[PDB]
Design a protein around this motif. Structure first.
Motif, PDB file in Angstrom:
ATOM      1  N   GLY A  57       0.807  -1.207   0.000  1.00  0.00           N
ATOM      2  CA  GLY A  57       0.000   0.000   0.000  1.00  0.00           C
ATOM      3  C   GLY A  57       0.843   1.260   0.000  1.00  0.00           C
ATOM      4  O   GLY A  57       1.771   1.401  -0.797  1.00  0.00           O
ATOM      5  N   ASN A  58       0.517   2.182   0.901  1.00  0.00           N
ATOM      6  CA  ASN A  58       1.258   3.430   1.022  1.00  0.00           C
ATOM      7  C   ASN A  58       2.421   3.316   2.001  1.00  0.00           C
ATOM      8  O   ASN A  58       2.943   4.327   2.474  1.00  0.00           O
ATOM      9  CB  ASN A  58       0.327   4.567   1.450  1.00  0.00           C
ATOM     10  N   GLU A  59       2.819   2.083   2.304  1.00  0.00           N
ATOM     11  CA  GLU A  59       3.867   1.841   3.292  1.00  0.00           C
ATOM     12  C   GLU A  59       4.922   0.842   2.821  1.00  0.00           C
ATOM     13  O   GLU A  59       4.703   0.082   1.875  1.00  0.00           O
ATOM     14  CB  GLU A  59       3.257   1.349   4.607  1.00  0.00           C
ATOM     15  N   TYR A  60       6.069   0.859   3.495  1.00  0.00           N
ATOM     16  CA  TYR A  60       7.102  -0.151   3.303  1.00  0.00           C
ATOM     17  C   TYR A  60       7.338  -0.845   4.636  1.00  0.00           C
ATOM     18  O   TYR A  60       7.599  -0.186   5.648  1.00  0.00           O
ATOM     19  CB  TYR A  60       8.402   0.482   2.808  1.00  0.00           C
ATOM     20  N   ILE A  61       7.241  -2.172   4.640  1.00  0.00           N
ATOM     21  CA  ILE A  61       7.313  -2.937   5.881  1.00  0.00           C
ATOM     22  C   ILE A  61       8.630  -3.697   6.024  1.00  0.00           C
ATOM     23  O   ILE A  61       9.015  -4.468   5.142  1.00  0.00           O
ATOM     24  CB  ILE A  61       6.146  -3.943   5.997  1.00  0.00           C
ATOM     25  N   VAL A  62       9.313  -3.475   7.144  1.00  0.00           N
ATOM     26  CA  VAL A  62      10.523  -4.221   7.464  1.00  0.00           C
ATOM     27  C   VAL A  62      10.247  -5.193   8.615  1.00  0.00           C
ATOM     28  O   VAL A  62       9.810  -4.785   9.690  1.00  0.00           O
ATOM     29  CB  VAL A  62      11.688  -3.277   7.843  1.00  0.00           C
ATOM     30  N   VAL A  63      10.488  -6.481   8.384  1.00  0.00           N
ATOM     31  CA  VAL A  63      10.226  -7.494   9.403  1.00  0.00           C
ATOM     32  C   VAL A  63      11.516  -8.145   9.892  1.00  0.00           C
ATOM     33  O   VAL A  63      12.251  -8.748   9.107  1.00  0.00           O
ATOM     34  CB  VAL A  63       9.273  -8.593   8.879  1.00  0.00           C
ATOM     35  N   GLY A 204       4.297 -10.132  11.283  1.00  0.00           N
ATOM     36  CA  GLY A 204       4.471  -8.724  11.588  1.00  0.00           C
ATOM     37  C   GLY A 204       3.214  -7.915  11.333  1.00  0.00           C
ATOM     38  O   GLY A 204       3.256  -6.686  11.269  1.00  0.00           O
ATOM     39  N   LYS A 205       2.089  -8.610  11.194  1.00  0.00           N
ATOM     40  CA  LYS A 205       0.816  -7.963  10.898  1.00  0.00           C
ATOM     41  C   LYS A 205       0.194  -7.328  12.139  1.00  0.00           C
ATOM     42  O   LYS A 205      -0.489  -6.308  12.044  1.00  0.00           O
ATOM     43  CB  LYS A 205      -0.165  -8.963  10.279  1.00  0.00           C
ATOM     44  N   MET A 206       0.429  -7.933  13.300  1.00  0.00           N
ATOM     45  CA  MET A 206      -0.138  -7.421  14.544  1.00  0.00           C
ATOM     46  C   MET A 206       0.757  -7.680  15.758  1.00  0.00           C
ATOM     47  O   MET A 206       1.697  -8.472  15.694  1.00  0.00           O
ATOM     48  CB  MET A 206      -1.525  -8.021  14.785  1.00  0.00           C
ATOM     49  N   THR A 371       9.312 -11.649  16.772  1.00  0.00           N
ATOM     50  CA  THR A 371       9.135 -10.914  15.526  1.00  0.00           C
ATOM     51  C   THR A 371       8.793  -9.455  15.795  1.00  0.00           C
ATOM     52  O   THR A 371       7.797  -9.151  16.450  1.00  0.00           O
ATOM     53  CB  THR A 371       8.027 -11.538  14.665  1.00  0.00           C
ATOM     54  N   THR A 372       9.632  -8.556  15.292  1.00  0.00           N
ATOM     55  CA  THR A 372       9.376  -7.126  15.399  1.00  0.00           C
ATOM     56  C   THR A 372       9.307  -6.515  14.006  1.00  0.00           C
ATOM     57  O   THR A 372      10.046  -6.917  13.107  1.00  0.00           O
ATOM     58  CB  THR A 372      10.464  -6.410  16.222  1.00  0.00           C
ATOM     59  N   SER A 373       8.417  -5.545  13.828  1.00  0.00           N
ATOM     60  CA  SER A 373       8.238  -4.920  12.524  1.00  0.00           C
ATOM     61  C   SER A 373       8.406  -3.402  12.571  1.00  0.00           C
ATOM     62  O   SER A 373       8.461  -2.799  13.644  1.00  0.00           O
ATOM     63  CB  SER A 373       6.872  -5.282  11.937  1.00  0.00           C
ATOM     64  N   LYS A 374       8.485  -2.796  11.392  1.00  0.00           N
ATOM     65  CA  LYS A 374       8.670  -1.359  11.263  1.00  0.00           C
ATOM     66  C   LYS A 374       7.962  -0.894   9.997  1.00  0.00           C
ATOM     67  O   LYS A 374       8.168  -1.459   8.920  1.00  0.00           O
ATOM     68  CB  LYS A 374      10.160  -1.025  11.186  1.00  0.00           C
ATOM     69  N   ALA A 375       7.122   0.128  10.128  1.00  0.00           N
ATOM     70  CA  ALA A 375       6.352   0.630   8.995  1.00  0.00           C
ATOM     71  C   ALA A 375       6.845   2.002   8.546  1.00  0.00           C
ATOM     72  O   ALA A 375       6.931   2.936   9.345  1.00  0.00           O
ATOM     73  CB  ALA A 375       4.870   0.683   9.341  1.00  0.00           C
ATOM     74  N   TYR A 376       7.170   2.121   7.263  1.00  0.00           N
ATOM     75  CA  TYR A 376       7.621   3.392   6.704  1.00  0.00           C
ATOM     76  C   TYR A 376       6.615   3.916   5.683  1.00  0.00           C
ATOM     77  O   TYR A 376       6.396   3.295   4.643  1.00  0.00           O
ATOM     78  CB  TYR A 376       9.002   3.237   6.064  1.00  0.00           C
ATOM     79  N   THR A 377       6.009   5.061   5.983  1.00  0.00           N
ATOM     80  CA  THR A 377       4.985   5.638   5.116  1.00  0.00           C
ATOM     81  C   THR A 377       5.602   6.312   3.890  1.00  0.00           C
ATOM     82  O   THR A 377       6.661   6.934   3.983  1.00  0.00           O
ATOM     83  CB  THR A 377       4.117   6.664   5.874  1.00  0.00           C
TER      84      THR A 377
END
Ligand code: NA
Ligand code: NA
Ligand code: NA
Ligand code: NA
Ligand code: NA
Ligand code: NA
Ligand code: NA
Ligand code: NA
Ligand code: NA
Ligand code: NA
Ligand code: NA
Ligand code: NA
Ligand code: NA
Ligand code: NA
Ligand code: NA
Length: 488
Positions: A57-63, A204-206, A371-377
């Motif tokens: 979507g409008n984000e980039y996800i790092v897991v 990393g979804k929730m 598991t840790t995630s990071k969201a970049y808009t």
């Protein structure tokens, strides 16, 4: 309380005394390591999947994933609520894997006498005790009710609001085995209602947290016998105990103390990728819920809870509640003070080996993948040229990705309109993906002077990725102006 005194010894015939002595020597002869009898061996993590980054979507996800260990020794045995009635003070059990599974094997032998004691406030050292002649389940439970009623009829008025003893445990959920090491095998029964989504967390979804909230109204404990044979009926023999499987591999133990009260299990969950979720969860629980900071306030607004409640009602009613995180502190509010209508159910207990009256401790060890995630808009760079001159822009940035083995790949990127002469009125938007960093914005204008043909208007480097960066230039050849503003 400290354990009460043992009741007077029951009368015995010569052979009954001989059998009691044989039982003593048999149990005292049992060789085992008390520190290694009760163990839970959790999962073994063979490998950890590499770090990965992707666009959604409008984000980039790092897991990211890391191997963790939970190694913990618990003296308090958890109770599976459905079979809580099997848990009572003085009960004889085998100390084996079934005790670890929170469904211990009970020795079906006849019993002698024991003394029960309760820790309710105000009672004298004579009032808080009672002798049970034949320590069956029915007789012990009736004795417990007798002690509770005795307190309600002598000391209750002198102590209106005695707060319950709080036993609290929380953990960010990652695997069943991890939570079993923390909350005991009894977690599996609770998880049939909570349904922790280990799959979604692993993707990393929730993010989810599991909470155990115990409100203990009172504890009932048993005397510690000076002889192992004291708990057995006069007709019990060593031969009978052997036939039942009481041995070095399955050492005999007794329930030395039972905690009664109300227990609330919580499943906090959110789709947020923030690293402040724990702190946010902590605030929504403690009443420290400060809406002064909007990052924690936002997580809470978009977080839900599921609650399983035992011993919170008159009978053995089980309450299940769903809702939003902001609506907590109401469930956690009730039950802080013991009263006659809600007497509480068994929710925890301790066990002692019959051999030396030593405390039985469950040794837990488990490995799990955190598991840790990071969201970049994503973001845009908006260019506006309205100056009375010819302009040329140079805008560049880096995009960071990851190879199959988790290592970073940094690609340099250039705007397609770089080094091209632009006349007013010029407008364009550069669409930056979430994994973009180190934004460089350069702009120059043609003055037409021989000693200074091009004049730099903007030279900003290593800029952060924002939602909307508006780059504007205007003015004249002699007086160029510019603005570099964010989010407006
Ligand atoms: Na943990
Ligand atoms: Na019971
Ligand atoms: Na027997
Ligand atoms: Na009995
Ligand atoms: Na019994
Ligand atoms: Na905890
Ligand atoms: Na597991
Ligand atoms: Na538990
Ligand atoms: Na356990
Ligand atoms: Na489970
Ligand atoms: Na349940
Ligand atoms: Na918490
Ligand atoms: Na022992
Ligand atoms: Na997570
Ligand atoms: Na990175």
């Amino acid at each position: 309380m400290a354990p009460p005194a043992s009741p007077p010894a029951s009368p015995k015939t010569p052979i009954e005394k001989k059998h009691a002595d044989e039982i003593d020597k048999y149990i005292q002869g049992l060789d085992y390591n008390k520190n290694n009898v009760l163990v839970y061996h959790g999962d073994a993590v063979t490998n950890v999947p590499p770090r990965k980054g992707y666009k959604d979507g409008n984000e980039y996800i790092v897991v990211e994933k890391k191997k963790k260990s939970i190694n913990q020794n618990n003296a308090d045995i958890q109770v599976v609520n459905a079979i809580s009635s099997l848990t009572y003070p003085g009960a004889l059990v085998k100390a084996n894997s079934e005790l670890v599974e929170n469904q211990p094997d009970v020795l079906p032998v006849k019993r002698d006498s024991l003394t029960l004691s309760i820790d309710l406030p105000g009672m004298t050292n004579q009032d808080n005790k009672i002798v049970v002649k034949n320590a069956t389940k029915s007789n012990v439970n009736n004795a417990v009710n007798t002690l509770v009623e005795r307190w309600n009829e002598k000391y209750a008025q002198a102590y209106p609001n005695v707060s319950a003893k709080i036993d609290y445990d929380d953990e960010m959920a990652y695997s069943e085995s991890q939570l079993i090491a923390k909350f005991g095998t009894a977690f599996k029964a609770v998880n049939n209602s909570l349904n922790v989504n280990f799959g979604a967390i692993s993707e990393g979804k929730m993010q989810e947290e599991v909470i155990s909230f115990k409100q203990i109204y009172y504890n009932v404990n048993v005397n510690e016998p000076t002889r192992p044979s004291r708990f057995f009926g006069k007709a019990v023999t060593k031969e009978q105990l052997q036939a039942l499987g009481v041995n070095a591999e399955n050492p005999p133990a007794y329930i030395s103390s039972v905690a009664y009260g109300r227990q609330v299990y919580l499943k906090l969950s959110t789709n947020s990728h923030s690293t402040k979720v724990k702190a946010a969860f902590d605030a929504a629980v403690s009443g420290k819920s400060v809406s002064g900071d909007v990052e924690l306030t936002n997580i809470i607004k978009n977080s839900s809870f599921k609650a399983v409640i035992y011993g919170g009602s008159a009978k053995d009613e089980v309450q299940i509640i769903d809702g939003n995180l902001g609506d907590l502190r109401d469930i956690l509010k009730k039950g802080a003070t013991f009263n006659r209508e809600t007497p509480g159910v068994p929710i925890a207990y301790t066990t002692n080996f019959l051999k030396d009256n030593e405390l039985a401790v469950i040794k837990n060890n488990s490995e799990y993948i955190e598991t840790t995630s990071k969201a970049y808009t994503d973001g845009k760079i908006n260019i506006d040229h309205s100056g009375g001159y010819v302009a040329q822009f140079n805008i560049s940035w880096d995009e960071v990705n990851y190879d199959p083995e988790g290592n970073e790949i940094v690609q340099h990127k250039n705007w397609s309109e770089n080094n091209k002469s632009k006349l007013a009125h010029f407008t364009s938007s550069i669409y930056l993906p979430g994994n973009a960093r180190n934004i460089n914005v350069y702009a120059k204008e043609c003055t037409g002077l021989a000693w200074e043909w091009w004049r730099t208007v903007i030279d900003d480097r290593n800029l952060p990725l924002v939602k909307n960066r508006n780059i504007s230039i205007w003015g004249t050849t002699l007086y160029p102006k510019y603005s570099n503003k964010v989010d407006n």
